Enzyme design. Structure first.
Site, PDB file in Angstrom:
ATOM      1  N   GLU A  91     -18.150   0.369 -19.313  1.00 26.97           N
ATOM      2  CA  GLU A  91     -16.719   0.950 -19.113  1.00 26.97           C
ATOM      3  C   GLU A  91     -15.666  -0.285 -19.119  1.00 26.97           C
ATOM      4  O   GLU A  91     -14.680  -0.196 -19.676  1.00 26.97           O
ATOM      5  CB  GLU A  91     -16.683   2.031 -18.215  1.00 26.97           C
ATOM      6  CG  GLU A  91     -15.163   2.815 -18.218  1.00 26.97           C
ATOM      7  CD  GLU A  91     -15.038   3.920 -17.258  1.00 26.97           C
ATOM      8  OE1 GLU A  91     -16.262   4.255 -16.771  1.00 26.97           O
ATOM      9  OE2 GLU A  91     -13.938   4.563 -17.217  1.00 26.97           O
TER      10      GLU A  91
ATOM     11  N   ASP B 215     -18.235   5.806 -15.632  1.00 26.72           N
ATOM     12  CA  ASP B 215     -17.808   6.584 -14.270  1.00 26.72           C
ATOM     13  C   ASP B 215     -18.206   7.900 -14.656  1.00 26.72           C
ATOM     14  O   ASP B 215     -17.930   8.622 -15.687  1.00 26.72           O
ATOM     15  CB  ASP B 215     -16.502   6.400 -13.802  1.00 26.72           C
ATOM     16  CG  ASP B 215     -16.342   4.839 -13.370  1.00 26.72           C
ATOM     17  OD1 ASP B 215     -17.094   4.209 -13.103  1.00 26.72           O
ATOM     18  OD2 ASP B 215     -15.326   4.407 -13.237  1.00 26.72           O
TER      19      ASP B 215
ATOM     20  N   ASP C 130     -16.356  10.140 -13.017  1.00 27.73           N
ATOM     21  CA  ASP C 130     -14.845  10.751 -12.622  1.00 27.73           C
ATOM     22  C   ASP C 130     -14.237  11.554 -14.061  1.00 27.73           C
ATOM     23  O   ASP C 130     -14.600  11.491 -14.987  1.00 27.73           O
ATOM     24  CB  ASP C 130     -13.934   9.869 -12.034  1.00 27.73           C
ATOM     25  CG  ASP C 130     -13.068  10.220 -11.056  1.00 27.73           C
ATOM     26  OD1 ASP C 130     -12.953  11.436 -10.562  1.00 27.73           O
ATOM     27  OD2 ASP C 130     -11.861   9.692 -10.678  1.00 27.73           O
TER      28      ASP C 130
ATOM     29  N   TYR D 124      14.598   1.072   0.866  1.00 33.38           N
ATOM     30  CA  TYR D 124      16.216   1.372   1.726  1.00 33.38           C
ATOM     31  C   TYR D 124      16.139   2.754   1.735  1.00 33.38           C
ATOM     32  O   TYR D 124      16.768   3.364   2.774  1.00 33.38           O
ATOM     33  CB  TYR D 124      17.327   0.773   1.147  1.00 33.38           C
ATOM     34  CG  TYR D 124      17.083  -0.873   0.493  1.00 33.38           C
ATOM     35  CD1 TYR D 124      16.711  -1.672   1.486  1.00 33.38           C
ATOM     36  CD2 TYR D 124      17.131  -1.083  -0.640  1.00 33.38           C
ATOM     37  CE1 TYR D 124      16.457  -3.113   1.101  1.00 33.38           C
ATOM     38  CE2 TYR D 124      17.015  -2.386  -1.198  1.00 33.38           C
ATOM     39  CZ  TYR D 124      16.484  -3.487  -0.100  1.00 33.38           C
ATOM     40  OH  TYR D 124      16.335  -4.737  -0.495  1.00 33.38           O
TER      41      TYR D 124
END
Lengths: 751, 751
Positions: free
Chosen positions: B25, B98, B100, B359
């Site tokens: 992959e 994989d 997944d 911030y």
């Protein structure tokens, strides 16, 4: 007619001088300015779109061409006269930027430098002005008006005078986007008196060239001194009259921005890690101390960002975490902080072939970390405070100098910092000689510290390297190994140079056309953590290497045809603990400089532990006395804790700070002494029923004896011949060496 | 000349059919394959670089041409014969990907579709094979051999049989990078029997066209049914013979990948939020429940990633958090989850002008969240378990339907999904009618639920909109407001359409050349949260506007010259609780579908609370009895907790699960009952000394009376005329309405 520009109604007219142009840092600044300029009848005396306009910051540069156009300002003319400046479309330009590192100092410096170069006079005559926003606001309970400070020094002086700050809330506004709606209204109510005008002095011009352009090496002397904060007198002059010098801005804000960029990519010589890596290690210690349970890299990165104030991006965070846990021949870390679970990378791609952080899992190397980075002296270290919240320490002081023990790259700029790890057989000898009295070279080494005699040797680490480390001239060279098979006309490469990736190495040979002609195809059958490269020669090219590469004495013909030799260049550039850059000529100097920091830390750790242990002895003795007298001082009859506390006082029970004694945390000795004795009786009222059992008393009594024995031992350790804690150092060095050896026996897996 | 390709020694020779090509992959997969193929003498029988090669996945697409080149395969020839197949350079190709969502199902589906489109016979004859790595490994203490499962169903069946799993550690390997060094060696020891071959059946032909290419409205039927997991029989057939059908792969793995992609941008109709937003809300509840203290957005994003398993990137996470706390006219959230501290955005840029997350600070809107998302029924909801760890709930069931109450926009990468928020009073009227018995439309509404009579009205929310919502035909239109000043020849725009950004609107007019000719300059003086746009007309241009745009009745001439009218298109696309996509014709159907889920949740929350409260009554009564008898059952005499526990048992003290009773958390009623009375005496031995005081007893005794009173009240609540908990729904609704009103009186600030 430039983008993100809103003209003023009177701009370019008779009231052009009354007009001012606001230079917003970005879209968020533009929204804040639009909010302030449109307060309407809520701020009758404040600024409005009349006599005021907005421009976005974001000669070739497009944005500067827009600022020039909207101002109606020309390059060639020098604005030395008032009549000449009257032609300008705006009376002044005001820059609205954040007060962070990527705020004042970088965007402001560039704008100041741009205006200084072309039109110096404008700065003298006050054309360029700046919007000064409050940096710290302190809110007190029951009071709706906060106390605002424009500098950290003023807040520090204020905090010292205020003593306890339990009822005061402190908020740090380090960016224009951190101001709330009510705060922005308050700022624009007094818009006039927060506008500060740049002034040009004699020092500014020399500093302007130093920090911007002006070649280099005149900036190095500036960057090796550290940041000097503005004194109280300078700040008062700034507030008394709103004329901020360009020199003070350059040497505070711009210098800090430059130093912050340098410290990102250059480590401290005490621990050999940068600020980002220090956050990861400190975050790793916190995350895995409670439960050393395997965690995903992205999950651990989220923990670091949440708990260590990491805001540089998950991509950089995940990459740094992956590098911290990578362990392979030629990796940057010889002793990784974390244990790598999964495919963290390989030497062939130089660590760039790591898996995705979602599947890659990380785990702290507790055995190595707890011994090399003791938790009992992490309380004693100075710490970074960022936005008023505690962050990673300023520096770590490990048992052995990691700056000598690791590999440092710093590939891009960053003072060309590079380090080659020294082996663990020379570093240990130096440190043990410094500490152990009975070591014959103990006296010689101390005499050599003040004279740089470097009696003992330091040599490159040959661990995980199946090659040759030869010394020629004043440099160290690492040689690869090759095998030649005459019958099959094959050259086999069994080892590469010290830190040469395999994939990059193959590309180097292929790109070299003159080398390439002797070979036809290169195939890589190298295993993980081992080099095995097949090089196929031409049928008649066997000799061509020999008579072409001339058989150099230092480098073999095959070692010349195949780039199997590299020079080890060491650039010992490091960050001082107080800031700035220090240059070391040789590694022993770094070791010599690191030695006192660990020696003092051991000495002052014993003082704190002695003080803490004495308080605990008092506390445990009181608790044991209560358990013995718990039957006839039965607390059931008394109504509340106040009556029970009064009864305990009447019987002669000392009030103690329950939480402070058990967990002194980050407390100095004098602060420890002044607070611990003043306490409540919570240490008695919070005792569980299981703590009154006979076995509980026996363990508590035995614990008291152990702490009393330890107290006498620590007093002996303070009065030691070389220095206090010398004997403790040697046993901690032994623990570190055992941890490293155990981690080296495994593949840094510790299992 | 193919990159990342390592040929086999026997590839293309007499043993080409024995050779196999490994399709990695990515780089991480390539490193794992290189590690496995070079085990050397440690795996004598395993695979090696002999008869095996590697290729990287990473007609115009380059890598597919590279795969074609290395295989020596041609497009035109159909491989229907063995002799034709023999010519191929490799006997088979194995894809190493994989397991997944961005694994099997997407890369595998593309490769399977690519080979099925050109050479279907290869799939039938087994040219394409796959590497089935173990998915779940269970480790038991004292055993070095784990139990490996290739499917989650097998693990679930195994876990059910194993009863207690305290001694078992479960690890999920959802990617090739999650395998450790020892695991990879174990996998390659049995490399042959983990290679699974692809088979093509009759159903695969139509599923390949459905999931890749073809018309729409046919894949839609596939995606509105949800993912059906492979049954035990199918997995057993897969395990018995390693021939995995293409149809089963397509309808499990590829369907899940498509459904996951759809759910990422389409919300559930029960709570009107996607999986990513659900994680942020659930993470927000956890973060700010202990202490509702303001936190930075990047810090909060780190917390969400660490605690809610968020791995989609900090950039998407920060953007979603910012959108969650944004509050302005036309914002996506009418009732933001968080309180926005700082500049979170404005309507002019459509929320794209938010400040930097460093911030920007965020804070949970606690007053609204607790009322709308009660914490006492969050335990009662189904939850997502990801990598074996608890994650955000599958869905939230709020007091009022948020999917109706919010604004929804989705880019057209799939189902359009545009939602327009309904009016608050109209929603409140419907829900109160459904619940309140005394409401005259209570009986009528129930009769309308089963017949879709939609007696009551639902209308778009006009809050924060100074415009007109007119109904023409079957559609709703939003009209802006304009002012015409004849003397100054200026058209002033005071309001835009419902969800039209100001900056985008100005761009639309400027880029419409026909409209532009009439005007010369557009200047935006709009304040924050208010539109005020100045349009300058040409001196005579007023008339031509009238005689060109023709003054249609629906849209005014100025409303035609200026695009001040927009159409509200509703695309009610939502995700079912069990998975899939559901279509709603009108908003009433969504509200009707959401009602039973909240009604059941109220009913079953009371039963759990009734059961939990009964146990607490027992525990508190026992504790009070001990405190009364603590004097003459003084535990000081007894040696340890075992002897004390025996004494407590002899006096008639019930053993209880101390931690489970005080905090039942995610426990069902029958699990609650079976694990409650089987405990220890920790609830007595852990009592602090402060709990034995007289005031402590009085509070405990008063607490017992309150819980007994509450127990009787809850029994009454279960027996209610409409349904159990009906009178608790009404009071909850009032609290939500008060919270919304209070948040609307402020700018969703609350203080």
């Amino acid at each position: 007619d430039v983008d993100k520009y809103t003209r003023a109604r009177n701009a370019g007219g008779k009231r052009a001088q009354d007009c001012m142009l606001l230079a917003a840092e970005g879209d968020s600044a533009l929204s804040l300015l639009r909010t302030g300029l449109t307060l309407g009848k809520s701020n009758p005396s404040g600024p409005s779109f009349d006599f005021c306009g907005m421009i976005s910051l974001g000669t070739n540069n497009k944005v500067l061409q827009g600022i020039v156009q909207v101002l109606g300002l020309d390059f060639n003319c020098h604005y030395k006269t008032q009549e000449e400046r009257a032609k300008l479309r705006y009376g002044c330009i005001v820059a609205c930027v954040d007060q962070d590192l990527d705020g004042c100092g970088k965007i402001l410096g560039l704008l100041l430098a741009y205006f200084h170069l072309f039109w110096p006079q404008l700065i003298i005559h006050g054309f360029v002005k700046r919007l000064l926003t409050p940096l710290i606001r302190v809110y007190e309970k029951g009071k709706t008006m906060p106390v605002e400070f424009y500098y950290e020094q003023e807040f520090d002086a204020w905090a010292k005078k205020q003593t306890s700050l339990v009822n005061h809330t402190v908020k740090y506004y380090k960016g224009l986007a951190a101001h709330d709606t009510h705060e922005v209204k308050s700022m624009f109510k007094h818009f006039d008196n927060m506008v500060y005008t740049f002034t040009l002095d004699d020092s500014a011009k020399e500093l302007f060239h130093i920090y911007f352009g002006g070649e280099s090496e005149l900036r190095k002397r500036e960057l090796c001194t550290g940041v000097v904060p503005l004194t109280e007198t300078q700040t008062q002059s700034i507030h008394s009259v709103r004329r901020i010098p360009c020199s003070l801005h350059l040497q505070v804000d711009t210098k800090a921005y430059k130093l912050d960029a340098i410290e990102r990519q250059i480590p401290n010589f005490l621990d050999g890690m940068t600020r980002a890596r220090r956050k990861i290690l400190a975050g790793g210690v916190k995350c895995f101390a409670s439960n050393n349970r395997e965690r995903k890299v992205f999950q651990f990165g989220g923990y670091v960002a949440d708990h260590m104030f990491y805001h540089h991006g998950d991509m950089s965070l995940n990459t740094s975490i992956i590098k911290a846990a990578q362990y392979y021949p030629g990796s940057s870390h010889l002793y990784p902080v974390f244990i790598g679970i999964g495919s963290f990378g390989s030497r062939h791609l130089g660590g760039k072939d790591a898996g995705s952080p979602r599947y890659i899992s990380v785990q702290l190397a507790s055995e190595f970390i707890k011994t090399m980075f003791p938790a009992e002296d992490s309380w004693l270290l100075p710490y970074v405070f960022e936005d008023g919240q505690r962050a990673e320490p300023e520096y770590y002081v490990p048992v052995l100098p990691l700056a000598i023990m690791e590999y440092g790259a710093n590939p891009s700029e960053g003072w060309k910092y590079t380090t080659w790890a020294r082996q663990l057989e020379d570093i240990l000898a130096l440190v043990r000689a410094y500490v152990d009295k009975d070591n014959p070279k103990h006296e010689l080494l101390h005499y050599a510290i003040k004279h740089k005699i470097t009696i003992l040797p330091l040599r490159p680490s040959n661990y995980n390297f199946k090659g040759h480390l030869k010394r020629f001239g004043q440099y160290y060279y690492s040689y690869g190994t090759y095998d030649i098979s005459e019958q099959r006309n094959i050259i086999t490469i069994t080892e590469l140079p010290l830190r040469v990736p395999t994939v990059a190495y193959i590309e180097s040979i292929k790109k070299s056309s003159n080398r390439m002609t002797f070979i036809e195809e290169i195939i890589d059958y190298s295993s993980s953590e081992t080099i095995e490269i097949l090089v196929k020669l031409k049928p008649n090219s066997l000799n061509r290497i020999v008579e072409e590469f001339k058989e150099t004495e230092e480098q073999d013909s095959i070692e010349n045809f195949l780039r199997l030799r590299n020079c080890l260049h060491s650039h010992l550039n490091f960050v001082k603990p107080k800031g700035g850059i220090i240059e070391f000529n040789s590694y022993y100097e770094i070791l010599y400089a690191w030695l006192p920091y660990r020696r003092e830390l051991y000495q002052k750790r014993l003082m704190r532990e002695h003080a803490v242990l004495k308080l605990r002895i008092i506390m445990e003795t009181a608790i044991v006395r209560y358990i013995n007298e718990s039957a006839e001082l039965n607390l059931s009859h008394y109504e509340d804790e106040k009556e029970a506390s009064r009864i305990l006082s009447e019987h002669g029970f000392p009030p103690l700070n329950h939480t402070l004694i058990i967990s002194p945390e980050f407390a100095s000795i004098e602060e420890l002494n002044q607070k611990a004795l003043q306490g409540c009786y919570t240490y008695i009222l919070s005792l569980q029923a299981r703590e009154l059992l006979i076995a509980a008393k026996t363990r508590r009594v035995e614990k008291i004896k152990k702490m009393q024995a330890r107290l006498d031992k620590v007093e002996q350790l303070l009065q030691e011949s070389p220095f206090p804690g010398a004997s403790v150092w040697l046993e901690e060095i032994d623990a570190v060496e055992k941890a490293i050896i155990k981690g080296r026996n495994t593949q840094w897996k510790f299992h």
